[PDB]
Each structure stands twice: as structure tokens, then as C-alpha cells.
A paper describes a structure:
Here we describe a systematic approach to generating modular and rigid repeat protein oligomers with coincident C2 to C8 and superhelical symmetry axes that can be readily extended by repeat propagation. Repeat proteins are composed of an asymmetric structural motif that is concatenated several times in tandem within a single protein chain. From these building blocks, we demonstrate that a wide range of unbounded fibres can be systematically designed by introducing hydrophilic surface patches that force staggering of the monomers; the geometry of such fibres can be precisely tuned by varying the number of repeat units in the monomer and the placement of the hydrophilic patches. All multiplexes follow the naming convention CsHRN_Rr where s is the cyclic symmetry, HR stands for helical repeat, R is the number of repeats in a single chain and N is an index to differentiate between multiplexes of the same symmetry.
We determined the high-resolution structures of five designs from C2 to C6 symmetry by X-ray crystallography, cryogenic electron microscopy (cryoEM) or both. C6HR1_4r matches the design model with an overall r.m.s.d. of 1.97 Å. Like C5HR2_4r and many of the other two-helix repeat oligomers, the monomers of C6HR1_4r interact at the inner radius of the oligomer, but the repeats fan out towards the outer radius. The C6HR1_4r interface may be stabilized by a repetitive cation–pi interaction between tyrosine and arginine side chains of adjacent monomers. The high-resolution structure of C6HR1_4r is the widest with an outer radius of 92 Å. The inner radius is 41 Å, which is large enough to fit a C2HR dimer.
Residue numbers in the entry:
A (entry chain A): 1 to 197
B (entry chain K): 991 to 1187
C (entry chain I): 793 to 989
D (entry chain G): 595 to 791
E (entry chain E): 397 to 593
F (entry chain C): 199 to 395
Write the structure that this text describes.
């Protein structure tokens, strides 16, 4: 067995090197096939976690350097693979904070609200795993920001309701109602412009 | 007769050797046409079964080494051809276990729930052919898992209802009610997340 | 006159030789135009029937060596041309029995139920022309087989209703009710699986 | 003036020779643009009629030698241009018989019922201009045949209703009622088949 | 500043000479951008009207020498630009007569009614700018002609109602009622044929 | 830190230099990624505002020299980046006047009503930032003009309703009614033309 495992690590290594030059996730799909083969053979769970890291920490670069959200969907399923292998909860929370930030930047520059839905499900996953409350308030305020901006750049009334649901999450978590009211006013102001269109 | 049969075997052989380098099921389609011609020519039923194994096995490799679902549809047909030629029930249950265990990995890595329906069809086929109750529950737990994951990776409420249906098949198959309620609570949690959207 | 007739036979045979190498029906479409021109010139009706055979018996080979079913639509039209020219009803039934077989192999290998409707139309045309009942039972049984298999590969409830209609044709031919009940049981079993989906 | 007129005739000639080698109506669209300039320059109306004839009698060759219907739409336009220029009624009736007599063979070989509507329009145009009554009935019987054949090759009930309306034109034009009942029986037979589908 | 002004005239010249040989309007879009820059630089209004004439009198020639309608949309815009800069009403009416004629020819040679709406808009614009009722009637009779022809060639009931509205404009402009009755009879004859569809 | 900041400034400016020659926004998207990296590295706010200016003042020239509107969407995002980053309100009003003054040309030369919505939201942003009444009213008259022109160049009722809403913004913001009544009469004339269609 261990010969194949080393050869599959070599495939993952060769494919990382090639993928960074080709800028395409298909090269890393082959690498995940090899990761799942190593898992099927049986391998140290920590080595499988670090192999998964050695892909997540390359998928970000690929997703940025060729602006594309779909590359991150493959990354997200590998986060649940590290969950199932027993990566520590603090490390999951670290990784998820980090991936939320590449969604946040990519959703802005590509001008697309649908990509933010990944961020919302990741924020609820960190609510499940127990990230500190002020840090949820931060990512919800931030994602309310990118929803607000995209609702102005592209005309669609629905985008503001998602932000209002995220305001109710900050209300449910507890925050000074002065901030809540400020945010509400901004969203209803943007609605009063989209009402015209 | 026998010369055409041998020349059709030689065609299957060379088409297989081409297909693995070419990476396309279009090559294997002509090989399967030639398998049907050898059926019409009355080649021995066991030889057809073995040639069909020596296409199912190549379809698995092709489907993995360039990821899409469609290649497997030929394998699903060829399983019923082996049923009809009289391959033993134990060998059908073997290949159906094995092929479900390629649907599962490809559904994850390509991020698509639609392929999972074929796995459910194959589960009910192994129910028809008499797989043991625990082993049916095992694939139903697994496919409930890949449904749960794709219901988180993309927003669509319907995916969880198919999972709920499959939990009720494990209930029909006598799974412990404590495990049923654990699984249910997870799916209702994912529905409460999708209710936001 | 006869110079144009020979030149059209030359066009037909040289385009046949070309088409087999190029693998496309568009080469034969020009030959079929040249066949209609030979009809317009009053070429003997038997010579025209034989020229139509010399296309039908090449259309099937093209339609196997590449898998697309649209090539057969010319064959179907040319069967009615031989009907109009007065080819014997027994020989129509022979050509139709032959053509119905290529429809089966493309339905299966292309994994597509929509082509089978053409087989149902041809079964009813042999009902019109007077095939012996037990041979309709064969084709009807076998076609409900391909319908049953594609209802498992491709998930759509409607396919089984065509199969029920074709069981009612076997019941209209008076086939023993033991077979009807077996076929029905297998179909409501497949419906009960598709009811899940 | 006459220099431009002759250079436009030369353009028509050069474009006709080019079109027949290139096999594309866009070369002839250019020639018709030039004919419309020659028409605005007020050259002899009979020369314009013969120039339009020398495009109609090349559009048909193009439309056969590669099969698509849209080439004929130019021809049908130029028929009304020749009507307006005052071409004798028997030439219109002759050319329109000829175009009906290309719509048939192209509608058959492309297996497309939708083109036949242009034929029915040209039938009613020859009803306006007058034709010997049995010749309308011949073209209506023929088009009722291509409608019947395409109602078998394409599964769609609607095609038989157009044919029924056309039978009622043969009824209005007074072919004997036994022949009408033969046509009707054949069409309700095809409807009883398409009722299954 | 005058250096940029003459350089923008030279850019118009260069891009015109390129466009007219290359045959694509995208080259003239840049020349118009340079015209709008010269307007912003306060180039004299009559020079700008002549520069605009020196593009309209090339858009038409491009739009004939390869046949598509969209090239004329620029010209329709630039006419209102010339209106704003103070082109004489007689120059507008002349030029709009000229452009309406290229819509009329292009609507025949390419089998499409949708372009004729732009001609109807220009008719109402010359109604606003004060063309005589008799000349409006001339264009309305012509556009009723091309509507009638396309209604027959490429069957759709709806096209004919626009022509009825345009007959009511000739009635409003004042036309001898026997002519209105002739046109109505021809148009209802065309509807009675479009009932056979 | 400062080495990465200088390298990111160099990576911006060298992509900008080639973006102008290549003529595509995908080059500048990578430069804007590197701008967000320089904010992440804490480069001083006034240098980041300068870089955002340097980028916007190249986005416009690209969006003119190739005529498509989507390039401006980045510019709108970077304007809100400068808002948040703390560029003074009067020079936001300057940049927003300047950017509206490319939409107003690009909407005409590549005929499209839909882009004007991006201008209307920027007008209401300059309302929020407090540009003077008569300067908004000028842009609203101008955009009511481009809405008027496109409502004539292509048929759609809705374009006039946006313009009516915008005229009522001028009534709210304060302008005498003779302008309102003139504008209304013109828009009602365009509705009366579109009522024909």
C-alpha cells in the first residue's frame, strides 16, 4: 500500500506545481481524486488534513489570479472533509474566516451577489462551531456592506432583504440598536431608489 | 461465425487500448456495438459477461480520469446486459456496490446532486436483488451524507426531501430510531439555514 | 435521357463510396436528390426500388459507425418511396423488421427514449401491412424492455405509460394474461421507484 | 446611365458564376441589391423580368445542391417583383408550379413539415391568379402526401389538421366524395396512431 | 485646442477609409466617438453637421454592400444630432426620405418585418417635421406594400394590423376611399390566407 | 511590508501600461486585486485614493476606445471605495459628474436603454452627497433626452415611464413648469407613436 500513497503524494505535488501555471481547477480535481484514493487506501488522518490544507492554500491563489468563484466550491467541500477527519475546531474557524475573505473580495470585483450565498452558509457554519460573537457581527456587517454595494451597482430589490435577515441575525446575537437602526435606514434608502426602477 | 467473433474481440481490445489514452467514451461506444454484434452471433454467454466486465472496468477508469457522470450510463446498461446473460446475483451486487462507490466520489468532486438519483436507482436494484439490510443502510447513510453536503454547498431546498425519503427507507429497513432522530435533526438544521435564502 | 440516368447512378454510387469514408449523411442526401431526379426521368420502378435498397442498406451502417439516430429518418422516408413504387408487402415487412433492430441498439447505447417513438410508428405500420401477430408481440415485448431499462437509467414517469399502451396492443393481439400481469408488475415496481424522485 | 446599367449586369453575371462555385445565397443577395439599383435606374422592364428569371433559375439549383429552405424566400419575393413589373400570368403560374415542385423534394429530404406552409401560400396565390381546377387538386393531394409522411416521421398531431383544411379545399373545388373519404380515412388512421404518443 | 479638432477630423477620415474597405460599423463607431469629442471641443455646428452627413452618407453604403439592419441605428441617432445642431428642416426631410428608402429595400432583400417599425417611426417624425400629406401617403402605401409581401412570404397574422393602422394614417391624411377599400380588400384577402395556418 | 507595497504599486502600474495597449478590463481586474492587497498591507489612505483615481482615469478611456459598458462597473465600485476610504465629497461629486458624462455618450453610440439605470443611481448618489439642485436637474434633462431618443430608436413603452419619474424629481428638486409641460408633451408624443405598435 505505502508505495501508492507516496506516488499519490507525488501526483498531488506535481499537479499543484502544474495547476499554478495552468490557472485551472481541473488539474486540482485530479489531485483530489488522488487524495480520495489515499483516504480509500488508509493514511494518517493528520497527513490527509495537511494534504487538504496544501490544496485549500493553493485554491485561494487560483481563484484570485483568475477571477472565478466556482474554484472555491471545490475548496468548501474539502473543509467538511477536514471536519470529518477531525481537524480541530479552532483550525476550522481559522480556515473559514480566511475563505469568507476571498468570497468577500471576489464578489465585489466580479460584481455578482449570488457568490455571497456561499458566505452566508459559511457564517452559519461558524455559528454552529461557535466563533466569538463580535466576529459574527463583523462578517454580517461586512456582508451587509457588499449586499448594499451590489444592490446599488446592479438593480434587483431582493438583495436588500437578505441583508435585513442578516441584520436580524445581529439582533438575535445582540448588538446596540443604534447600529441596527443606522443599517436599516441605509437599506430602506437603497430600496427607495430601487423602487423607482 | 468464429472469425467475425474473434475480429470483434480484437476490435474491443484495440478500442480499449485507444480509449484509455484518448480519454473519451466515444471510442468505447463502438466497442459496445461490437459486443452486441457478438451477442447476435451467439458467442458464449459467460464470454460476453467477462467482456462486459472488461468494459465496466474501463468505464470506471475513464469516468474518474476525466470527471463527468455520462460515461457511467453505459456501465448501468451493461449491468442489466450481465443480468440478462445470467451473471450470478452475488457478482451483480459486487459491481453495483463498486459503481455506487464511484457515483459517490464524482458527485462530491464535480459538485452536482443530480447524479445521486442514479445511485438511489442502484440502491433499489440491490434491494430487488437482495443486498443485506445493514449494507443497504450503509449506502443510504452515505448518500444521505452527500445529499446533506450538496444541500450546504448550494442552495436548493428539494435535496433534503430526497434525503428524508431515504431516511424513511432506513426506517422501513429497521434502523434504530435514535440514529434516525440524529440524522433528521441535521437535515432540519440545514433546512432552517436554507429557509433564510 | 439514358445519359442522365447513368450519370445519376454514377453520382449515387460514387457518393455512396465517399459517404462510407467521410462518415456523414449529407453525402447521401445528394445521392437521394439524384434518386428523385432518376424518378423524374422515369427510371424503371424496380431499378428505383433496388437503388433505394442500395441506400437503405448503407444508411444503417453509417447510423451504427457513428451513433446519431437522425440518419435513419431518410431510411424511413425511402421505405415509403418503395411502398409507392410497389415493392412487395413481405419485403417491406422484411426491411422494417431489419430497421427496427438498429433503433433498439441506438436507443440503448445513446441512452435516449425519444427515438423509440419511431419504432412504435413502424410497429403500427407493420400492423397496417400485416405482419403475423406473434412477431408484433416479440417487438412489443422487446420494446417495452428498452422502455423499462431507459425508465431506470433516465428518471421520467411518462415512459411507462407508452409501455402500458404497448401492453394493451399485446392484449389486443390476445397474448396470455400471465405475461401481461408479469410485465405490469415490473412496470408498477419501476413506477414506485420513480414516485420517490 | 447605361454604363452603370451594363456594369450592374456584369456584377449580376459575375456574382451568379461565383455563387454557383461558392454554394451560398449571400452572393445572390448582392446580385438582387444590384437588380434593385437597375430597377431604380429604369432599365427595360422585360430585361428586369429576364434578370429576375436568371436569378430564380439559379436559386433553385443552389437550394437543391446543398439542402436548406431559406434560399427559396428570395425566389418567392422575386416572383412578386416580376408580377409588379407586369410579367405574363402564365409565366408566374409556370414558375410557381416549379417552386412548389422544389418545396416538395426539399421538405421530404430535410424531414421538415414547417416549410410546407410556403407551398400552401403559393397554392392560394395560384388560386388568385387562376389555374385549371384539377391541377390545384393535384398539388393539394401531393402536399397532403408530404404532410401525411412527415406526420408519421415527426410525432405531432397538428400537421394532419392543415391537411384536413387542404382536403376541404379539394372538396370546395369539387373532386368526387369517395376520393375525399379515402384521404380522410388515411388521415384519421394517422391521428389514431399519434393519439398514442 | 484646434490641433485636437483637426486630428479628430483626420481620425474620422482615416477610420472612414478603413471602414468602407473593411466593411464593419464598429470602425465608424470610433469615428462618431471622435465627432462627439469635436462637439465637446466647440467645433462649429455646420462643420459638425457636415461631418455627420459625411457619416450618414457612408453608413447607408456599408449597410447595402453587406446586408444587415443594425448599421442604420447609428444614422437614426445622428439625424437627431443634426436636428440639435440646427440642420435645416428641408435637409432633414430630404435625408430621412433617403434613409427610409434603404430600410424599404433592406426589409425586402432580407426576409424580416421587424426593421419596418423604424421606418414607421421615421414616417411619424416627418409628419412632425411637416412633410406633405401626399408624400406621407406615398411612403405609407410603399410600407403597406412591404408589410403585405412579408405577411405572405413568412407567415404571421400580426404584421397585417400595422398596415391597417397605416391605412388609417392615410385616411387621416385624406385619401380617396376607393383606394382605402382596394387596400383593405387585399389585406383581408391576406388574413383569409393566414387563417389557413 | 514596504517591499510588498512597492511591488504591488509596480504590479499595478505595469498592468495599467499594457492594459491601454491590449484594450480589455481583465488586465485591470488583477491591478484592482493588488489595490485591495495594498489596503490589506495598510498603505496610506491618500496614496490608495491616488491609485483609485489613476485606475478610474484609465477605466473610462478603455470603456470609450472599446464601446461596451461593463468596464464602468469597476469604476462605480472604486468610487464607493474612495467614499469609504475618505476622499472629500466635492471631488466625489466631480468624479460622479465625469462618470455620468461617459454613460451619457456610451448609451447612445451602442444604442441601449438599460445602461442608463447606472446613471440614475449615480444621480441619486449625488443627491445624497449634496450637489446643487440645478446641476442634478441638468443631468435629469439630459438623461430624459437620451431616454427620449432611445424610446424613438427602439419600441418599448417603459422607457418613457422612467423619464416621467425623472421629470417629477426635477419638480421635487424645483424647476418651473413650462419646461415640465414641454417635456411631457414630447414624451406623450413618443407614447402616442408607441401606441400604434
Amino acid at each position: 500500500m505505502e508505495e501508492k500513497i507516496k506516488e499519490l503524494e507525488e501526483k498531488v505535488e506535481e499537479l499543484v506545481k502544474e495547476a499554478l501555471e495552468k490557472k485551472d481547477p481541473a488539474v486540482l480535481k485530479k489531485a483530489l481524486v488522488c487524495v480520495y484514493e489515499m483516504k480509500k487506501l488508509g493514511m494518517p488522518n493528520e497527513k490527509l488534513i495537511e494534504l487538504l490544507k496544501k490544496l485549500v492554500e493553493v485554491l485561494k491563489k487560483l481563484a484570485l489570479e483568475r477571477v472565478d468563484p466556482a474554484v472555491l466550491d471545490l475548496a468548501l467541500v474539502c473543509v467538511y472533509e477536514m471536519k470529518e477527519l477531525g481537524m480541530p475546531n479552532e483550525e476550522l474557524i481559522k480556515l473559514l474566516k480566511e475563505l469568507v475573505e476571498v468570497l468577500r473580495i471576489l464578489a465585489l470585483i466580479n460584481v455578482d451577489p449570488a457568490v455571497l450565498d456561499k458566505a452566508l452558509v459559511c457564517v452559519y457554519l461558524m455559528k454552529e462551531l461557535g466563533m466569538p460573537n463580535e466576529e459574527l457581527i463583523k462578517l454580517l456587517e461586512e456582508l451587509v456592506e457588499v449586499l448594499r454595494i451590489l444592490a446599488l451597482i446592479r438593480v434587483d430589490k431582493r438583495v436588500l432583504d437578505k441583508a435585513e435577515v442578516c441584520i436580524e441575525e445581529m439582533e438575535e446575537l445582540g448588538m446596540p440598536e443604534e447600529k441596527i437602526k443606522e443599517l436599516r435606514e441605509e437599506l430602506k434608502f437603497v430600496r427607495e431608489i430601487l423602487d423607482k426602477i
